[PDB]
Write a protein that binds this ligand. Structure first.
Ligand SMILES: CCCCCCCCCCCCC/C=C\[C@H](O)[C@H](N)CO
Ligand SMILES: CCCCCCCCCCCCC/C=C\[C@H](O)[C@H](N)CO
Ligand SMILES: [Cl-]
Ligand code: NA
Ligand code: NA
Ligand code: NA
Ligand code: NA
Ligand code: NA
Ligand code: NA
Ligand code: NA
Ligand code: NA
Ligand code: NA
Ligand code: NA
Lengths: 244, 296, 48, 97, 244, 50, 244, 296
């Protein structure tokens, strides 16, 4: 139960210090029913070429880090064959298998909260005073694969408490216990299909709740890598490639 | 005749594999007798929060319990019990003199996000599907009931919004309208679930249109048309100025409610309607604070 | 968008310009819901 | 089916009858563009001349496939091949064939 | 299917470039039921003497023509035995088989919209400004066999769009395809019988949607002939002959 | 020219999937369309005037 | 039999002057058997997103044209989702439905030979004298979508007679008879899969055997358009996108 | 349970739908009696070459024929009858003095594309699978048979090619070798189909490696390694110079032949081995010419 292997497509992930697997809302990704669908054109289900593990950028965990987030359909729109299909097709649909990995040693300590927040809408500080109706820039609402850093993690940059973020599919990475978190997310939206460009079904939040710490001499560079794989990907409404 | 990986393929399975099942729970669970347990191997108290699952430890395994036949109902915490209570969601002013609807008519953009109480409750969930019951309480700014005839009209998106008290749009040949006197009891009406989506979204993490998303258009981020149900228009049924100043309070009661994906409850004060902005200089804690962690 | 796949070819004696008429309608799976008034009202002053 | 005013350009008093049809003629052979229009039924534009577009005006929402039939009214001796394309949402007006 | 013959009475029409036959509202002309009738006198059903093809005047299609129209019970009220019965009897009832013919060559081009518009009420331009409540003269509302020319075809001289005129039984005459249009119309009215003099059940519209064109040298005279035959004609309420 | 609308269906123009359409056609019946009260008359009974 | 419609993917081709359909070597495209395959990884069969009609550039038929050719896996490697898959995957396999279209009038004349030549290896004139061992440049062996023009059609630029090119799946476009040629080609190679970049399974040749001709006054611009659709496309050996 | 377009899907069909079938034809088809036919509707003589199919018109429908029982065999036109005839494909010189293999050994790159007769025949097809029988005829340049012992060695690609008459590679611990005297009848040996492909390609329209294909490397266009079977080495079995000048002619006879996709037969003179280059200034017609089209 502490060891596990995730194989999908032509990619395999290994781990010897896992903490089980979470299946968001107790549901596995699935394809769209014939009665839940509307688009009449036959969709493309590329399978193995898009349903595989993509490893996005690595972040560095510092004793003062606040946390980061990634919007999901988004992080992959410019990567591999998944990205190509997401650009050529109007409609997209899929679940995800998210595997956040971060290892240290038996002498390091700290705890990361890895959670999935559906429809993660970002807010602004409203000019500090709260009298200015400002809005988050495109660079912040859809940060891409590089993710974005939280400025006010306590309120998740959206006026909501992070202490309650656990009502969402989550898992923790407690260095003294495990070195990775695995969460499987089904397609969640009020529509059977939607644009992979304009809409971000959910956001991945990785936030240090218990600060990283260690004594001088132990390796100081502790990376946090994000690996994710689409599941049951379906695309429809073919046309030319659109970036945004 | 056909390639094996295609026969044994599972691409196409439309049924969602559910790991959990909804069981009957009309009352709180009972407590069963428990005795001392001095043994190795079994540790109910020890958990691993890293897994992401709440502790499954029960009272019985932590202390010696008696038998309690719990018959406390769980009915008042259903979604309908919680949401089926009318609350203020709109307020329209029709003054005699001023700069706010002084021509005897008003157009209220249907949005229940203008009042904190009602808004905070619904924002506990991401998606919600429901029918509703709207009640319109009208009177003067002093609460005085006056003999005046009003006309409320629901203008779905695309229909012509009235530009004056004598607008031709008030013919309501197709739009639903209600004619009431302020002396009659508040008008009440039933509304269905009219979104083109399968549910309303209190949160839409995306943009409504394609193209470049420049600074000037960031106004559209988080704006979902599937939630924009149209306009609510009011007027003095006449061709001359009304003799009294009016106010119309709109109350909404949800019925036949379905809700999905719970979220953290609003932590900071609300500032605007179309977004979750908060005052960055006044970020207050979720709750009360104290002097020391070792003292009450 | 209509494009020329090849070209409009014609002999000597026949017009160099012809017209196309587009006719539109809905399919059998077309449906509409939620009645409202048309965006336009064909009247300016009272109708006598 | 009712006539779709794809050529909704002429507003002149004497030229109203020509919005009912658009021209096609001998070109230079480089896949030239002929005409363009939004497929949106209840939107201001060509569809406003159709019965479908008019009935839509009375309803807030619609669903379903649409169809457009093009009738060539050239002479019997005239030949040609056209490419009518439909670009789903997100796709900007195609720059070329 | 491109060839056809219409025989009725002692008249026969031939065509080798037809485009099928349209039966208005999917109903063939029929006689009046015993339960749909009111007039108690026994009607006259002259048959072959009135249910035959009558060929009315010919029009010339010019590169600048706007279109013409004919009111129907009317066009025949002063022709043959049909006209006599229509004049001697108060009540009249019947369907029609309308055959508009116009041929050119494989080098001419153009398209005529041939449609049937029930209760075709004519309006006026209201003095241009729209402040004068003027009305169309008898010569225009009931033009007779000579038909009448449209002044503003775009609005059918009645404030309604011609682009939607296709919701009515119609057919087109596209010179590169066919050289005639055949439409069969049943008796349509809110009464079982009515006066052939005061009321015109419908109007026949022949309008050029795609202008006629050809190169100099090809015959320039391109006629449009209207042939029509009553069907299931019934008359009642006999008296002296009345012209109007 | 025949005067009939195109009978071409989606299935024959592109490769389609199966869609079980359960969208109601009830709101487009004549009663749904016309059974909505609308202004058709207006009568004035002033104190002084013509 | 003169009329036809080819529907595949979200694209449809129409024709009213066809000359039947040729199925190269009497075999329809098919997927790779489990006993004919070697690559052990599960392939991608994108279906509708890649098996559709792609319309490549148009050529102008002149009274002096010599002919053109297109290498096939190649022409599509930089177009649509087919191109993306061909670039991301090492191995590719597929058949094709080629539809060459060219219309004129009943007063124009000429005949094009449209043929498919497997393993169409290009040769050079060897410096004219034949003493210089020169080789065709990349721009000529794999011309892309723009195709390439033949310098010596009589020998197909490869020292072989065009008069015998009819032993290959072919069809003619005789302007007085038809205005298009349709040829369906199965996957032909000595391997079950191969690179879409390094290898060109066959070449499409469009050559005027009977010169185009017409009298001054008739439209002089007579285009030849090439439309083609992959069939039963399969890709394997996923990696990063490679252009060549 | 599963989406319909996936159930009714046909993606995966590995069986090739064939429109034609191979029928027995041991002899030429017979002719049947035919009589006059004066009728409308049926026109055997009229065809449409545009379709791309050869005329299906038969003798019987064009003229009044008699009955002929054709018993002419079609056996001599099978692929084996056609190709199973030994022909020259290689020639190796081992002179005493010169600049061409003067050290008593030679390495012939196995390629049957060096001689026109054999080459033109095989190039009638695109792909070919077959076993072969190689015969080596050795003697001096005058045709004189000399008492000399030679060693032929097949060096598959990857094996060490001998650099001298006394090379260590002549130990043939694994490579197949043949030791013969010129006084013995020509050595003959059987070779299997040794390509990693399912057949040899006389034409490969592509490049063997990826990357940029610059002017300098156009040398590789049309080069398929699946056809490069290795080297054939010869030497004087000794450590001193031979007393006579030698020549080795290599003949090849194909057996168990399979062939696919016929092509137009070579039209112009051959110039090089690895390609179809032709002399652009000497492009001759496929055949003979005459003065006028109306005169023999
Ligand atoms: C006289 C008739 C009056 C009829 C009034 C009908 C009102 C129907 C209101 C439906 C309101 C749905 C509100 C749901 C979502 C909010 O608009 C969005 N979350 C705002 O962003
Ligand atoms: C003493 C043992 C000698 C054994 C010699 C074995 C020779 C086997 C030769 C196989 C030759 C196959 C030739 C086939 C194709 C040509 O090489 C290519 N088309 C050249 O481009
Ligand atoms: Cl629309
Ligand atoms: Na599903
Ligand atoms: Na618990
Ligand atoms: Na209980
Ligand atoms: Na107004
Ligand atoms: Na239709
Ligand atoms: Na249905
Ligand atoms: Na196969
Ligand atoms: Na024959
Ligand atoms: Na025989
Ligand atoms: Na050596």
């Amino acid at each position: 139960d502490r060891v596990a292997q995730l194989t999908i497509g032509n990619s395999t992930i290994t781990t010897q210090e896992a903490a089980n697997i979470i299946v968001g809302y107790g549901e596995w990704p699935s394809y769209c029913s014939d009665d839940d669908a509307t688009a009449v054109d036959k969709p493309t289900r590329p399978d193995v070429s898009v349903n595989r593990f993509y490893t996005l950028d690595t972040k560095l965990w510092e004793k003062s880090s606040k946390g980061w987030y990634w919007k999901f359909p988004d992080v992959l729109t410019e990567t591999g064959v998944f990205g190509q299909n997401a650009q050529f097709h109007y409609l997209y649909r899929s679940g995800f298998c998210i595997h956040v990995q971060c290892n240290a040693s038996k002498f390091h300590q700290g705890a990361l909260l890895v959670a999935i927040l559906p429809e993660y809408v970002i807010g602004t500080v409203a000019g500090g005073t709260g009298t200015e109706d400002s809005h988050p820039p495109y660079k912040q609402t859809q940060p891409g694969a590089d993710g974005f850093e939280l400025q006010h993690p306590y309120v998740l940059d959206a006026g909501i408490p992070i202490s309650q973020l656990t009502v969402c599919p989550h898992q923790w990475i407690n260095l003294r216990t495990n070195n990775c978190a695995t969460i499987i997310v089904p397609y969640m939206n009020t529509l059977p299909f939607d644009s992979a460009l304009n809409h971000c079904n959910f956001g991945l939040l990785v936030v240090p709740i218990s600060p990283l710490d260690f004594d001088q001499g132990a390796t100081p560079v502790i990376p946090i890598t994000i690996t994710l794989a689409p599941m049951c990907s379906e695309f429809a409404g073919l046309r030319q490639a659109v970036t945004q | 005749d056909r390639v094996a990986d295609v026969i044994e393929s599972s691409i196409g399975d439309s049924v969602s594999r559910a790991l959990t099942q909804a069981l009957p729970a009309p009352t709180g669970q009972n407590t069963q007798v428990s005795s001392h347990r001095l043994d190795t191997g079994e540790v109910p108290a020890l958990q691993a929060a890293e897994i992401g699952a709440s502790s499954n430890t029960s009272d019985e395994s932590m202390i010696e319990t008696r038998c309690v036949l719990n018959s406390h109902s769980t009915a008042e915490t259903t979604l309908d019990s919680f949401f089926s209570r009318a609350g203020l969601v709109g307020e329209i002013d029709l003054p005699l003199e001023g700069t706010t609807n002084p021509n005897g008519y008003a157009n209220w953009d249907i949005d229940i996000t203008g009042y904190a109480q009602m808004r905070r409750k619904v924002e506990l969930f991401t998606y919600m599907r429901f029918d509703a019951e709207f009640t319109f309480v009208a009177c003067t700014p002093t609460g005085q009931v006056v003999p005046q005839l009003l006309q409320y009209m629901f203008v779905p998106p695309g229909a012509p919004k009235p530009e004056s008290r004598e607008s031709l749009a008030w013919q309501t040949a197709t739009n639903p309208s209600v004619f009431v006197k302020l002396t009659d009891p508040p008008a009440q009406v039933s509304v269905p679930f009219m979104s083109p989506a399968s549910a309303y979204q209190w949160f839409y993490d995306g943009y409504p249109t394609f193209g470049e998303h420049k600074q000037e258009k960031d106004l559209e981020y988080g704006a979902c048309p599937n939630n924009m149900m149209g306009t609510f228009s009011v007027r003095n049924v006449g061709s001359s100025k009304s003799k009294y100043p009016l106010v119309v309070r709109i109350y909404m009661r949800m019925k036949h409610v379905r809700a999905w994906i719970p979220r953290p409850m609003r932590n900071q004060n609300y500032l605007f309607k179309a977004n979750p902005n908060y005052a960055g200089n006044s970020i207050k804690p979720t709750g009360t604070s104290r002097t020391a962690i070792t003292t009450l | 968008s209509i494009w020329y796949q090849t070209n409009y070819v014609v002999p000597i004696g026949a017009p160099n310009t012809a017209y196309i008429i587009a006719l539109a309608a809905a399919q059998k799976n077309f449906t509409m819901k939620l009645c409202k008034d048309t965006s336009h009202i064909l009247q300016t002053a009272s109708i006598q | 089916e009712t006539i779709l005013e794809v050529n909704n350009v002429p507003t002149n008093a004497t030229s109203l009858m020509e919005r009912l049809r658009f021209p096609v003629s001998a070109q230079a052979g480089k896949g030239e563009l002929c005409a363009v229009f939004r497929a949106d039924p209840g939107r201001d534009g060509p569809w406003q001349s159709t019965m479908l577009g008019q009935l839509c005006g009375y309803y807030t929402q619609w669903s379903g496939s649409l169809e457009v039939t093009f009738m060539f009214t050239g002479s019997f001796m005239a030949t040609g091949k056209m490419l009518i394309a439909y670009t789903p949402p997100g796709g900007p007006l195609p720059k070329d064939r």
